[PDB]
Structure 1
């Protein structure tokens, strides 16, 4: 079972997650791996809008933007990808995100970061790993 391979309370490192999202993807087609991050901003305030692009080391087409709840979502590869390639794409997105903490936001910028495939449990990850 998948549920028992993921600890909902545990925070995983970028490497661990990459190797775990492969055991969660069971579909016969190739699921997309997606990164989500709840930002330390206020959706209410407009000068706290995060919108930038980034080139994935292993891919390339990706531009992010905060949603109505101050959250950022982005695909970082396919579940078929070798684990080390997912791990690099995950870091490249974060390291890029962190450079955009708006001047008008006080507090931790990365409040929660997790990874998911098209179906299944989410994998909470330590972004500083």
Structure 2
């Protein structure tokens, strides 16, 4: 519950195979948004069930609430 308050963000693919989560604030340092995007990269990557065959992380992006929507290459 502690992390629920200090920083949490969970995972849960919805009906069609997708997840959503907070990985950086708006006015928040760029490098930061980067790092969190990352921690998510990882835990997600881990969750990756062994039932995957091929292009698993199909579409990975950053989009806001009411705003822009652009994919990100969590590689670089």
- Normalised by the length of structure 2, the TM-score is 0.81
Report SS of the residue matched to 1:97: helix
Gaps of 5+ in 1: 1-59
Gaps of 5+ in 2: 1-6
- List per-residue Cα deviations over 1:59-115 (Å, max 9, x = no partner): x21111101110010012310111111010001101221112211221121001111
Paired residue total: 70
Q: Runs of 4 or more off by more than 2 Å in structure 1?
A: none
Which structure has greater strand proportion? 1
Distance 2:65 2:13 in 1: 20
- Normalised by the length of structure 1, the TM-score is 0.51
CA contact (8 A) 2:24 2:34 kept: no
For the pair shown, the structure with the greater C-alpha radius of gyration is 1
CA contact (8 A) 1:115 1:124 kept: yes
Root-mean-square deviation over aligned CA pairs: 1.2
Structure number with the bigger relative contact order (C-alpha 8 A, sep ≥ 6) is 1
